[PDB]
Symmetry: C2
Subunit: 260 residues, 2 copies
């Protein structure tokens, strides 16, 4: 259960990113824009799995593309959350095997939606209701990502955020640490000294993404999502990124700058 | 309001097509397969519109690809309907303009899903609740196709069928007449005399799709969806196709062959 405080802090980070680019961003957007964007990225993830039962295919998805898609969904869902302040869900479970062992005699055509889980209230929903790991299994992924579309459709952005963070952990990616590292790099890229070549890397020739990876590799998801100290760990990741990219002391921001 | 009798007859036509290819097709499939397929085809339709508000794009979708996608959805939704015998919907309306004229003072961040229409029961739902025409307008299309995904997610296949038939009419395509014509051609293609070149076209050199178009061009949607006489009109379309493709009298089937 990802703390609502942590979820709110991530959304404030995203508001920061969005506000730098356009101070009036919220006025130009609607909640439905972010729902659509989530739905489209979830569809892209779905389509990379071998779901088409009538084709002779295929290789499971590229893990790097999956990570990119999860990261993209996170940006959309954090942006969505900034525009919101009983709604029932009818979730898919992973594709079932035929009824057997003497239960096949009540396996008749049922009311539409019988295969869906019992109605779950959106405000009572947890991950175990709608995400199925591991995502290496096709049917688990198909149910999970369809469920993400269901939640995006109800504008349940915090649940979507939680879900993609968990999905990322499942495939070995610490999306919270990555998000905070990349957030910092976004600010560095707008600095005069970055743009003019004054600020240089701690290791010449190493690509930005490999540098970020080095900054975040010591941290597990649990390490950066404790309700008590997450701000400190995110500040540590910020500092690590500033160091790696050669930012002078006086140009750095603390985590408290971004958090309300 | 498309008659439930007509919807059932279309689904029986589809069961016919599916049963020819695999007599045990239903045992291999689940309702969720068809929901997924619908969702993926709706996503493809969505992605062909210029929805990405951060890109300098683009030309509205290709009308022929739209027609193909609607036709594909119809096959999936008719197949879905054959596997089923209160569920709430929260539909999108087309993207709103900002609140004004002195209502802007209650435009505050609201409970998630506030922009969605009031809950509509799936069994009370009509087209006017979720489809917005014309589909030449981007925001109308985006709301409509997202709503189709909502209904596919609840396995409301008959509503999906109705919706794509109406969508097809909106862009000038009689999808019912086309479906029946193509259904007939599917059977002709499995006939010995077709496969061996014995059965020849009424006009040499004309492509199959242009021939089908000639068979169906006299019919409006209303012409082929009257509860009283639709079977007769579908039989007339079958006969027209058999004639155009050179089928001997004794190899033809009547509409009553397919309908239960």
């Amino acid at each position: 259960s990802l703390s609502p405080l942590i979820l709110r802090s991530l959304a404030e980070l995203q508001d920061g990113l969005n506000t730098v680019v356009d101070k009036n961003w919220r006025q130009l957007r609607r909640p439905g824009d972010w729902s659509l964007a989530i739905t489209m990225e979830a569809a892209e993830l779905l389509d990379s799995y071998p779901w088409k039962w009538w084709k002779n295919v295929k290789a499971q998805p590229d893990l790097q593309n999956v990570k990119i898609e999860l990261t993209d969904i996170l940006h959309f869902s954090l942006s969505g959350a900034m525009q919101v302040s009983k709604h029932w869900c009818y979730f898919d479970q992973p594709r079932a095997l035929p009824a057997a062992g003497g239960a096949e005699y009540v396996a008749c055509v049922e009311t539409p939606g019988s295969s869906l889980s019992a109605p779950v209230s959106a405000d009572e929903c947890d991950l175990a209701d709608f995400m199925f790991f591991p995502l290496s299994d096709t049917n688990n992924a198909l149910a999970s990502f369809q469920n993400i579309i269901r939640l995006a459709s109800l504008q349940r952005f915090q649940l979507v955020t939680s879900a993609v963070i968990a999905a990322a952990d499942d495939i070995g990616f610490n999306l919270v640490a990555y998000y905070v590292a990349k957030h910092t790099l976004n600010g560095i890229r707008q600095m005069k000294g970055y743009k003019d070549g004054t600020y240089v890397k701690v290791q010449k020739g190493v690509e930005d993404n490999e540098l970020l990876h080095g900054c975040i590799s010591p941290f597990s998801l649990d390490d950066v999502t404790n309700e008590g100290n997450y701000k400190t760990k995110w500040d540590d990741i910020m500092h690590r990124v500033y160091d790696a990219f050669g930012t002078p002391k006086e140009e750095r921001l603390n985590i408290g700058h971004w958090l309300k």
